[PDB]
Each structure stands twice: as C-alpha cells, then as structure tokens.
Amino acid sequence: LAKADQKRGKKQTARETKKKVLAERRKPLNIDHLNEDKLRDKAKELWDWLYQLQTEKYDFAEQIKRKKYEIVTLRNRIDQAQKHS
C-alpha cells in the first residue's frame, strides 16, 4: 500500500501542478474572423513567441548533458573519497 500513496499521490500531484502552469502561457486563440493582414506580423509574433518556447529548450537540454557529467565527476569524486582509513 505504501507504493500506492507515495508514488500514487506524488505523480498525480505532479499532473495538475503540470497542466496548470500551462493554461496561462497558453493565450486562447481568440481572433477569429476580423481583418486580413494582421496575421502577418502576428503569425510571426505567435511565432516569435513560438520560436522562444522552443529556443529555451535546447538550452534547457544541453545544460543537462553538462550536469549529467558534472554529476559523474562528483559521483566518482565521491567514490574516490571513501576509503575507511
């Protein structure tokens, strides 16, 4: 049962906390049927943001291959520091 209130009441606790920080930077696509050359600048605006979203990513990523490393080093710097003597 401790595997059904720990891992069960934490990932679900992650979901809302997940889905939530999402319906806000998510500006409802309102503009439906008005004028013609708005989309212009606009498309690349939603895009410009679009671009962003994504761009923040790789950064978000590669910064992980750095620590997945800094990690090891440490880990070993830890397995090189034991010695019961």
Binding site: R25, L50, Y51, E56, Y58, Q63, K67, I71
Partner: protein, 116 residues
C-alpha cells in the same frame, strides 16, 4: 643528492603550462560549435517560415502553430522537470561529499540566485 631535479619539474610545470594552454582554446571551440550544433539543429524544427496569399490557409496554419506550440511547450516542460529533477540529484550528492571529505557547499548559493 638528486639536485639536478630543478629542471624536471620546471618542465613538468613549464609542461603542465602546455596542458592547460590547450584545453583553454579547446574550450571556445566545442562551443562556437555547440553554437552551430545549435542553430543548425534549430533551422528545421521550425525553419525560415513564409507568408502565403490570402484566404482559408492562414487561419489554419495557425491552429497547428498553436497546436504543436503546446505539443512543444509540453516537452519544454517534461524538461525543466527532468531538469530541476536532475538538478536536485546533484544537490543530494552535494551533501555526501562535504561531510565526509570536507569541501563545503557555500559556493553555489550566492551567485546563482539572481539570474534565474
């Protein structure tokens, strides 16, 4: 009485001088490269898009844009997650090292805060 051992280190030092002198320049390459491995890898998940003519198509393209946008941001999320996640792990091995060895964790705290 091994005296001539003033040049064997000189080297080793005059030497280690070479070691670093290498990695240094090697630092800003894997970067100006990691700089391109970047934009090159980026040129396509959403390339130099274009603007059509008039009607029913723009209205749509959008849909997807916003559509995948979430498809994107989503993964952008799974990220900061598996990120802060892998962010904490390091910090839990941060504690393991100081208390046994004696290195301390004061360094990271101060600097980082402001930016993020």
């Amino acid at each position: 009485e091994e005296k001539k051992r003033r040049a064997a280190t000189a080297r080793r030092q005059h030497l280690k001088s070479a070691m670093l002198q290498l990695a240094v320049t090697e630092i800003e390459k894997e970067a100006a490269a990691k700089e391109v491995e970047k934009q090159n890898y980026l040129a396509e998940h959403s390339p130099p898009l274009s603007l059509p003519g008039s009607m029913q198509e723009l209205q749509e393209l959008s849909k997807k844009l916003h559509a995948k946008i979430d498809s994107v941001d989503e993964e952008r999320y799974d990220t900061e997650v598996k990120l802060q996640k892998t962010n904490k792990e390091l910090e839990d091995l941060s504690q393991k090292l100081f208390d046994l060895r004696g290195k301390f964790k004061r360094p990271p705290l101060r600097r980082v805060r402001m930016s993020a």
